[PDB]
Amino acid sequence: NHNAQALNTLVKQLSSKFGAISSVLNDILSRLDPPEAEVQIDRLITGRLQSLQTYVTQQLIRAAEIRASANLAATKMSECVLGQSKRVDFCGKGYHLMSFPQSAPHGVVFLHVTYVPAQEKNFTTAPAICHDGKAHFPREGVFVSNGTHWFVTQRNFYEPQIITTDNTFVSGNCDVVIGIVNNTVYDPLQLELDS
Amino acid sequence: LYQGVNCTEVSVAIHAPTWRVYSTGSNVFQTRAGCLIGAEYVNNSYECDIPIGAGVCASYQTQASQSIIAYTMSLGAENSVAYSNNSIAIPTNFTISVTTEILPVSMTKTSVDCTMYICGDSTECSNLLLQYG
Amino acid sequence: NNSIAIPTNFTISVTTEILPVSMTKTSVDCTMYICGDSTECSNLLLQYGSFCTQLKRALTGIAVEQDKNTQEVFAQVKQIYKTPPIKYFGGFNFSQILPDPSKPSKRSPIEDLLFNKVTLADAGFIKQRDLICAQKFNGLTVLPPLLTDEMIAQYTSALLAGTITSGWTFGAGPALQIPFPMQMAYRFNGIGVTQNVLYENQKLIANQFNSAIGKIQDSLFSTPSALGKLQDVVNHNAQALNTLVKQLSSKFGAISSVLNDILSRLDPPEAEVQIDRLITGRLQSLQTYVTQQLIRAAEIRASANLAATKMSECVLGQSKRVDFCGKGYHLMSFPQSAPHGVVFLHVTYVPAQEKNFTTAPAICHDGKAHFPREGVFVSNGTHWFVTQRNFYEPQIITTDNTFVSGNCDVVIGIVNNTVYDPLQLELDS
């Protein structure tokens, strides 16, 4: 629309007279003789030339905006389509899984497949888990409790496991962590090595 | 919306003088953007249909009769999260959602025949034009 | 060849980043400017084509854009989150950035330090000598922005109440609450430091935060021309809108500028000449104004696409892009609105108090090389350890923080040491 609009305002500015007796040059030439025509034609030329100036200048500004937008569509191509983005809300709302490009007239359309969490559930949490006077932090998860028992799930999906000692790691004593709770960290060895 | 006036102005009482002879006579509300005439100022707060400015939107809502209402847009649902020293919320399902994003990549590439436009295809006018550098 | 330096403390540092988001949306009454409110001059003007329309259309593209800009940046959340009544976030004191209930405007004690420093003026007073704001009296107008600064400052209370109570979850789905000092432990994992580092030092991290956010008041406010970037998009606009007006009284080669004069004075035809000069001049003046504002508005859009990106990536997430969200390792950001712009407070983790050590690629134990699983080998001079790379926390080199690959024959710089196996110790019953 903006392009056809500025390309129509350009044409329909040919029939403006800018202060000439008429717009038609053929007329002013078949009519009034050279010198007194040179005056009018000079007005029409100044006008019809500043009209092109404004057209071109408006299109150099519009084209800088399309370039700013085709450098973003080129970035979104490389990062969303040819990869998996971690930049938030870059490739669609959610956690980006992948994107698919689809062409369109004078543009591109990305279908951003994202992973949205759903059906949350309150739990009770804890920074660490004091077992032997030593604090146990989760190795790659979070401690939750279904009210009575403690587990260690991944942070993005409720999948509770038993707090063993190979999904938690130890550091220090239960004396400095604010909010630590007492619980049992099941060791697979001592269970096995109680032969 | 008479942009940027007091209604009490807007022809104190429209009687004419106000260029734009035509007149409207419905409820006269006073936005901070001008003197919105013709729209009834409800006291709800919806989404924004037609931005008027200074926080006021306007929309066409059913009352039986469908009328034009002007409200103060609401920024969305309200939601406090049960923040607690020791409580966390963890998803249990998920949702794969596909959204789209349209982007302009290129625009129409024109060219102009500087003379044939300015001077008309066939004119010693063009012979004058080259004077212009 | 064999010496590494490893931090032993750290530093939570809050820096700010001011960005212009939108500029003043003007409109022009092409005739009333060019031709003066009341003149058959206007009847001459329509001869000059649709210039009146192109300028109207261009200045409306700009003016609706300035409401897109302010909406891509702030209108990001679905909903308007709200912090609980009891604001105890593990020790962190977000009072300086959370909304203030006492105040009428409900702006944070830092957003108020920002609406005061940027001394601006709305020249479109529905109100009735204050300033140049009377430009509104020459065919020019200043449309008000669609989102009042009471809303923008309430899109920011959300996005700040969602990023405190949810973390980065609220920008990827439903906001799922999470205790703050634990969301911060996630944000420490994200930069390569383990969690125990946070929970052990939770007091002094909360104190480092709470104080680094205190000094932001002074840094912004007391240091003058902090908001130079916001202030210039006000100065440049009032400047080009004043050069426009004061170009009405230029004569461009007419006996006078006043049209009323040239009409009460010299008769129609010999007036048509002068008025044609004044119209050419007063119209090219509007051309240059509009064109300069289409270039300036493309610059504000380039800057409101960056502030919109920084919002999503710094605020609604945790960035790994270096120096994007402030200098340091990004922990989180907090937005604060400002007149015609946005201010990010980038909380970053800066290492400090390093310490030389002696390092090694691998550790030859049984003719097999042991590389660290997720750390680095150091030595306090005599004994070898394996720490994480970003914080000196030395542990004993067991065989479950190192992994084996090959024999000590190809690694250049490997050293001999003992890799303590927990099994053989246990299984020497």
Curated annotation (Swiss-Prot), chain A:
Effect of mutating D166H: In strain: Alpha/B.1.1.7
* UniProt protein name: Spike protein S2'
Name the source organism. Answer: Severe acute respiratory syndrome coronavirus 2 (2019-nCoV)
Q: What does this protein do?
A: Subunit of the fusion protein that is processed upon entry into the host cell. Mediates fusion of the virion and cellular membranes by functioning as a class I viral fusion protein. Contains a viral fusion peptide that is unmasked after S2 cleavage. This cleavage can occur at the cell membrane by host TMPRSS2 or during endocytosis by host CSTL. In either case, this triggers an extensive and irreversible conformational change that leads to fusion of the viral envelope with the cellular cytoplasmic membrane, releasing viral genomic RNA into the host cell cytoplasm.
Q: Please list the disulfide bridges.
A: C80-C91, C130-C174
Query: Where is this chain glycosylated?
Result: N122, N146, N182
Consequence of mutating H149Y? Answer: In strain: Theta/P.3
The parts of the chain that form a coiled coil are 1-41
Q: What is the effect of changing L29F?
A: In strain: Omicron/BA.1
